[PDB]
Design a protein around this ligand. Structure first.
Ligand code: FES
Ligand SMILES: [Mg+2]
Ligand SMILES: [Mg+2]
Ligand SMILES: [Mg+2]
Ligand SMILES: [Mg+2]
Ligand SMILES: [Mg+2]
Ligand SMILES: [Mg+2]
Ligand SMILES: [Mg+2]
Ligand SMILES: [Mg+2]
Ligand SMILES: [Mg+2]
Ligand SMILES: [Mg+2]
Ligand SMILES: [Mg+2]
Ligand SMILES: [Mg+2]
Ligand SMILES: [Mg+2]
Lengths: 107, 122, 85, 99, 128, 96, 23, 72, 137, 48
RNA sequence: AAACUCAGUUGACACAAAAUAGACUACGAAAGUGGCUUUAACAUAUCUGAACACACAAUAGCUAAGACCCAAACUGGGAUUAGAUACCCCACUAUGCUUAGCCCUAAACCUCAACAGUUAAUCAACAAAACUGCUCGCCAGAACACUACGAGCCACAGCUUAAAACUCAAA
RNA sequence: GAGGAGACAAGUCGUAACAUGGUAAGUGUACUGGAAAGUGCACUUGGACGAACC
């Protein structure tokens, strides 16, 4: 259950000192906030260690380098898949809310 | 009034434990307590390594002494328990049964706070 | 003075230390220990602590009420029945 | 707050409109509507309930009176002399099937 | 103070109480009771000593007697807790309330006021 | 007037209040099992009332009893006692 | 509200303390 | 209404019942409604004890053939 | 039995055995993940030292120490040092919330050692020893 | 009743006479205050 | 960068502070009060009422004697900058704690006085909807001015009370 | 004798405040400093923390 707001705020007829001091009114808005906005590092470290121990010569590093390339490709593919899959979203939720606006006044 | 002494004694042999219990109850009576009951909660590993009288303890025997004593005797009893070596720990509390189960019909629902802001239109 | 390896201890299942560490971090986060350590790094003066607690409580109230409203209105996300009017 | 005089009471947190009062109110309203229609005034039905928009429009078209169930553009009555021509005639009675 | 062996006000009216065991008497005595019970016994003694109707707790005399017992308790507390500012305030406020009640009783019923002053050892003094 | 008029009376359909699980039961600082039922298994942190579901009075009593046991040596502080891990789960918590 | 009056009082008080220290 | 207490007890004892509510029928009579009618006519007969009336109504409806399968 | 995340009860008939050793017998890996530095020390069931490592010892200097890469390097070094001591299975007991908190374990694994348990032991004062004043930037 | 009930109990108090017997009896016996609570409000007592 | 050779595990170990509970909204007149136990204890009325007295009054500060983990004005060093008497880093002192006295100030603000009552016909704006009765306290343009003089005070670079001249049409 | 205030008025050194005023601002109190001021302890919002989960 939602925390009780009874007697929390500073109001006339409230003997107790304020429990909450909301810098903004505690009234629901008609909108929600927009969705707020390093991979492959282990593979990079592995490949760099192989380079370090082989004098940065691909001859033995072939495997680690191939793993690095595969990991980079996987990261790019995951980026694309996430971007496409992202498009309830804030736009739809706000559209739903606008049909049922909060009414802090009297009709 | 009525007190319960929760006592944690050094885990020791039956003769030593009996001697310590006799000593503690005798001190209570001398200070004026009227011992009502003595229940043994058994020996068990302490929840943490208590160190009493420079001696560390991992296990101890838990006992309860329900008694009635004058208010002034509680401090003296606490001091004597502290000074007693065989007692790992000891606390005198007000006996729980002196408290009552005053009726609590349930979890009454708290309605959403109303009239917390003016009805001004914006 | 407590028994070691009982508190905040997670047994990694089948060697998936990643999953074990994530579960342990979840446990600590739910218990609030991570936030407690982060705040305790530097002293939070009592007035600032009170202000932060008040702000967090107000934020919790608002977010819980907004989530309640969102869930309550979710059913109305259906397709329009009276299309054409 | 202003519907308290017309609410017979509450049944399980649901209000019951006093049909006793509704009878007299509807008698007066229907008598007034009949008088206006007899006098040939313009009667305009109004309802933003999309469920019954079509039904109200059909009823108005059948009874030879006008209906406005769509989005009510601002000034459609106060600014009518501009939105319809200076000589437009406004409705003589408006019937809100949904207020 | 009343003797420690004094029975609690609740049990002083119990029939056949005198026949009970010595240990039971001790447990029901003030010796095994907090200071509040001793204060209540004191208040009952003052009531039976002074007021015309000892069962009239709501009278001005009963109020004055109870407040005097409370003031005595606060003075006893402060004799030991010399730094208890809250209880110092309570003692001073109680003394002021006793003065006001005594003034009202003096204005209303002078004979009862004399009896109250004598019984509670209060020496009424006019304000400067 | 009219026999069918409503009659003043209390809601006969009112439902009984959902008494908290511990309501009407004696919380004791020695019932270390019950006290451990309301702490975090991993950190020994006392659960909030939103988790426990307890009424305010019983939540306060549970907290005070937990503190008393912990400081008097009846209960551990930093973790739930292992022996009570498999006790019935009455806290609405889900770590895994 | 703004704190212009508090700022004026602040400057007054600071100058007074400085003058007292100086004399 | 007076019958609301009887309705509350009936719903507590036997639940909503197997038979649903056909509110579209203005003259629909529910199992609880028949229980209330039987209770009322028994009260008219004269029984004044609440529990006695409840048990008598249950027995009479069971004889009539009502499925008063108690929830508990 | 389905997996139980809780550690085995001390002094109890537990069936779990790692290379035939009991949980109380498995060696320990104390990781201190300070804000700018990470340190790893492997000790025995009797807290006998087995190996030590840190960002500084591995060679990262100044800000570079407080990085996941340095933590993984220290973990690898500590694991390699412990392997010569014969440590296979270890119970990780990490304290601190530095950037190396998890990279230390990852390096300790890449070095070959297997982890059986993670035990956070970050010192959380219930209250005491007032910390330093807040930084204003 | 309160004084009467107390009168019966006092017979079973610990005094300097039955001190040894009662100490031995307490050592020989045990008391377990632990009992779990289920989500249904039922009290699960430990097996004894 | 300066700085320490000290750092990690385990054990012993406070006169410092009091996670979680607390999404609780309680106690106290206010300041304040959130580890545990005990003792004492939370004025009165079915009103208001004090520079006109008595008792309190966060933090800071003063005197004396102790404690000193940690923090920390000041001070020193490192860094920064055009300069940096600061912001960032390190060390440390008064001080924060205890005892006994002083000091009596806070944006001591919930900037919303106490008691009683109403929601009825509203309301400059914002803020925490608008009012009725009653009593006390306080205010009469801005600045001069938490100032000068006088007075009182364990206060001595202080606190309370507190003006006037000159100036302006504003604030 | 000297200080204080206000006014007139330009320079001077800085940029302390007004925006998160570039270290949020301010109250009390103490130390310090060319100068607005810096910092320490407590207090206020006459700041914000973007206000479902993320
Ligand atoms: S619901 Fe009744 S005691 Fe908590
Ligand atoms: Mg000035
Ligand atoms: Mg008064
Ligand atoms: Mg005054
Ligand atoms: Mg003071
Ligand atoms: Mg010092
Ligand atoms: Mg001042
Ligand atoms: Mg002055
Ligand atoms: Mg003077
Ligand atoms: Mg600036
Ligand atoms: Mg600034
Ligand atoms: Mg400041
Ligand atoms: Mg400085
Ligand atoms: Mg304040």
């Amino acid at each position: 259950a939602t925390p009780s707001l009874r007697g929390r705020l500073a109001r006339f007829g409230n003997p107790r000192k304020p429990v909450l001091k909301p810098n903004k009114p505690l009234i629901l808005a008609n909108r929600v906030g927009e969705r707020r906005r390093a991979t492959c590092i282990t593979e990079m470290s592995v490949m760099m260690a192989c380079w370090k121990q082989n004098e940065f010569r691909d001859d033995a590093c072939r495997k680690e380098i191939q793993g690095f390339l595969d990991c980079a490709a996987r990261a790019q593919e995951a980026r694309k898949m996430r971007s496409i899959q992202e498009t309830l979203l804030p736009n739809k939720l706000n559209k739903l809310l606008q049909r049922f606006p909060n009414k802090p006044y009297l009709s | 009034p009525r007190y319960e002494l929760a006592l944690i004694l050094k885990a020791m042999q039956r003769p030593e434990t009996a001697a310590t219990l006799k000593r503690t109850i005798e001190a209570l009576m001398d200070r004026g307590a009227i011992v009502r009951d003595l229940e043994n909660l058994g020996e068990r590993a302490l929840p943490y390594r208590i160190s009493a009288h420079s001696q560390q303890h991992n296990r101890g025997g838990y006992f309860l002494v329900d008694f009635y004593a004058p208010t002034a005797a509680v401090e003296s009893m606490v001091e004597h328990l502290s000074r007693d070596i065989d007692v790992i720990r000891g606390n005198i509390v007000k006996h729980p049964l002196t408290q009552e189960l005053k009726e609590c019909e349930g979890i009454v629902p708290v309605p959403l706070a109303e009239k917390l802001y003016s009805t001004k239109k914006r | 003075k407590h028994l070691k390896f009982i508190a905040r201890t997670v047994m990694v299942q089948e060697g998936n230390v990643e999953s074990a560490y994530r579960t342990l971090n979840r446990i600590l986060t739910m218990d609030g220990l991570i936030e407690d350590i982060k705040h305790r790094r530097y002293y939070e003066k009592p007035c600032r602590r009170r202000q932060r607690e008040s702000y967090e409580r107000c934020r919790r109230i608002y977010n819980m009420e907004m989530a309640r409203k969102i869930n309550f209105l979710m059913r109305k996300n259906r397709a329009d029945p009276w299309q054409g009017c | 707050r202003f519907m308290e005089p017309y609410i017979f009471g509450s049944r399980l947190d649901h209000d019951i409109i006093d049909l006793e009062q509704t009878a007299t109110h509807l008698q007066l309203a229907l008598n007034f509507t009949a008088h206006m229609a007899y006098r040939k005034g313009i009667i305009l039905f109004i309802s933003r309930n999309r469920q019954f928009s079509y039904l109200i429009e059909n009823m108005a078209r059948d009874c030879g009176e006008y209906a406005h169930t769509r989005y009510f553009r601002g000034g459609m009555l106060t600014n009518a002399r501009l939105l319809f021509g200076p000589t437009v005639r406004l409705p003589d009675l408006i019937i809100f099937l949904h207020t | 103070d009343p003797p420690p062996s004094t029975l609690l006000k609740d049990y002083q009216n119990v029939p056949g109480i005198e026949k009970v065991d010595d240990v039971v008497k001790r447990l029901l005595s003030l010796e095994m009771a907090n200071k509040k019970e001793m204060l209540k016994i004191k208040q009952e003694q003052f009531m039976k000593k002074i007021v015309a109707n000892p069962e009239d707790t709501r009278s001005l005399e009963a109020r004055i007697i109870a407040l005097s017992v409370k003031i005595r308790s606060y003075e006893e507390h402060l004799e030991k807790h010399r730094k208890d500012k809250a209880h110092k305030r309570y003692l001073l406020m109680s003394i002021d309330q006793r003065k006001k009640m005594l003034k009202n009783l003096r204005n209303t019923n002078y004979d009862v006021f004399e009896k109250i002053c004598w019984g509670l050892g209060i020496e009424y003094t006019f304000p400067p | 007037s009219n026999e069918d008029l409503p009659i003043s009376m209390e809601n006969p359909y009112k439902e009984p209040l959902k008494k908290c699980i511990l309501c009407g039961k004696h919380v004791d600082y020695k019932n270390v099992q019950l006290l451990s039922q309301f702490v975090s298994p991993f950190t020994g942190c006392i659960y909030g009332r939103h988790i426990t579901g307890l009424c305010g009075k019983k939540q306060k009593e549970i907290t005070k009893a937990i503190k008393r046991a912990q400081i008097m040596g009846f209960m551990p502080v930093t973790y739930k006692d292992p022996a009570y891990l498999k006790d019935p789960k009455v806290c609405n918590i889900r770590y895994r | 509200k703004n704190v212009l009056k508090i700022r004026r009082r602040k400057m007054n008080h600071h100058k007074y303390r400085k003058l007292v220290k100086k004399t | 209404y007076h019958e609301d207490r009887i309705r509350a007890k009936f719903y507590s004892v036997y639940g909503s019942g197997q038979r649903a509510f056909d509110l579209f029928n203005p003259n629909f009579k529910s199992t609880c409604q028949r229980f209330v009618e039987k209770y009322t006519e028994l009260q008219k007969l004269g029984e004044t004890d609440e529990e006695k009336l409840f048990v008598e109504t249950g027995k009479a409806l069971l004889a009539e053939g009502v499925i008063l399968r108690r929830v508990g | 039995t389905k997996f139980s995340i809780y550690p085995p009860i001390p002094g109890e008939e537990s069936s779990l055995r790692w290379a035939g050793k009991k949980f109380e017998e498995i060696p320990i890996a104390h990781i201190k993940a300070s804000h700018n530095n990470t340190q790893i020390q492997v000790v025995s069931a009797s807290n006998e030292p087995l190996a030590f490592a840190s960002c500084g010892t591995e060679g990262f200097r100044n800000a570079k120490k407080g990085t996941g890469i340095a933590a993984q390097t220290a973990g690898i070094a500590a694991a390699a040092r412990a392997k010569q001591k014969g440590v296979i299975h270890i119970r990780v007991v990490v304290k601190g919330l530095g950037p190396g908190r998890l990279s230390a374990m990852h390096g300790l694994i890449m070095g070959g050692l297997e982890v059986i348990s993670i035990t956070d032991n970050t010192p959380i004062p219930h209250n005491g020893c007032r910390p330093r004043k807040a930084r204003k930037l | 009743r309160e004084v009467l009930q107390l009168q019966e109990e006092v017979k079973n108090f610990i005094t300097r006479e039955n001190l040894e017997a009662r100490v031995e009896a307490a050592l020989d016996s045990r008391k377990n205050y632990n009992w779990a609570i289920t989500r249904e409000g039922l009290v699960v007592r430990p097996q004894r």
